Structure formats: structure tokens, C-alpha cells
Amino acid sequence: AQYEDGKQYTTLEKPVAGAPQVLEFFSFFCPHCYQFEEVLHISDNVKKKLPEGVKMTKYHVNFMGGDLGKDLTQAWAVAMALGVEDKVTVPLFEGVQKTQTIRSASDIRDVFINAGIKGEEYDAAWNSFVVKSLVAQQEKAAADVQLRGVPAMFVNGKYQLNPQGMDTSNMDVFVQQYADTVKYLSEK
């Protein structure tokens, strides 16, 4: 076939019932994740090729960067609750990997302030039980798939993208193969 299990994707030995349709995992400490966001724009190109009726989910993980890694998972919960993902994603990536100006929870907080989220609003969210349960959801989703590596994408809790098996000669061709694979898997 043109799309082969173990080639552009792998199948989960134990499928995850009720899982989000398109589920992506990342870390602000993860170098290919930085590429996926800034240079390749994977999430957005997947969206553009996904059918109608499909929701896309993106979660942060704890297993990179120790204590700061966990702060970042809570901060991403804050971003999701406030709906400000598209305003903090880039400065968070750059603060961690490019400028290395993010070293504490206060520095994460500065990124939200500079993006125009108000201190009051940020701290209330940070401390809210809605963010607590949002952190729980991120952890549970990752736990459900025994996740030990990022970036990662899962389709319908059954299939996991395998970018290792795609030509990286051309970044544009790579992104399209990736997106086309998500679509194929979506329709499966």
C-alpha cells in the first residue's frame, strides 16, 4: 500500500477510547517541537487539510526540563483556559530555547504580561481549579499513550504519526506528507 503501518505511522497496541480526534503533544524544551512550530507550522498545515467537523488538541508534557517543565504544563493550561495560545507559543519557545530568558515561573509569567494578559487575570487562572483540572487532562492524555517522546501526534487514539519515515530533503514536502498522512488516518 502507499500508507503502511510502521511506515508513516504506527498503530497503538492498546487503543485509547474517547480520545481527541487529532491529539498533539509537545514541550517548550523540545527542539523538534520548536521547528514544528516556528519553521514548519505543522499544526496549522494539518488544520488546513483536515475535514469539516474535526477538532484539534495540543498538550504540553512534564518529562522535559524538570521543575520548569511542570511550570510550563501549568502555564499551557493557563493559555488554554484564557484562549491565548496563539499569543504566547512563540515567545515561550524563544524564551526557553533561543534567548534563554526563561528560568523561573516568574519569567513564564512575564511572557504572558508582555503579550498583554493582565497580572490579576494570569495569577487567578494560574491558581484556579479549572487550570488544575486542565493540567490533569494533559497528564492523563499523555499517560493513556505511554508517552516518552515529543513531538507526537495521535489520530483518534489509535494511530501515531511517524515522521522518521518521511523524506526530509525538502521541508515543504515533509510538512505536506505529514499533513496528508493525518488526513488519510483521519478518514481511516
Own/partner long-range contacts of 162-169 (Cβ < 8 Å, ≥24 apart): 162/6, 162/7, 162/8, 162/9, 162/10, 165/6, 165/7, 165/8, 166/8
Whole-angstrom Cα distance, residue 188 to residue 178? 15
Whole-angstrom Cα distance, residue 92 to residue 53? 30
Sign of torsion, CA 131 52 10 34? Answer: negative
What's the chain's length in residues? 188
Experimental technique used to determine this entry: X-ray
Q: Report residue 68 as a C-alpha cell.
A: 520548569
Residue 126 one-letter amino acid: W
Q: Report residue 119 as a C-alpha cell.
A: 497580572
Nearest to 138 by CA among 51, 55, 72: 72
Nearest to 50 by CA among 157, 153, 179, 174: 179
- For residue 96, CA distances in Å to 81, 91, 105 come to 22, 8, 12
The residue ranges of every structural domain in the chain are: 1-188
Residue showing cell 512575564: 110
Residue 87 one-letter amino acid: K
> In DSSP terms, which residues pair with 160 in a beta bridge?
10, 154
Q: Which CATH architecture has domain 1-188?
A: 3-Layer(aba) Sandwich (3.40)
DSSP for residue 94: I
Helical (H) or strand (E) element with 88: helix 85-93
Nearest to 30 by CA among 80, 92, 119, 84: 92
Task: Determine the straight-line distance between the first and last CA of the chain, rounded to whole angstroms.
Answer: 14
Helical (H) or strand (E) element with 9: strand 9-11
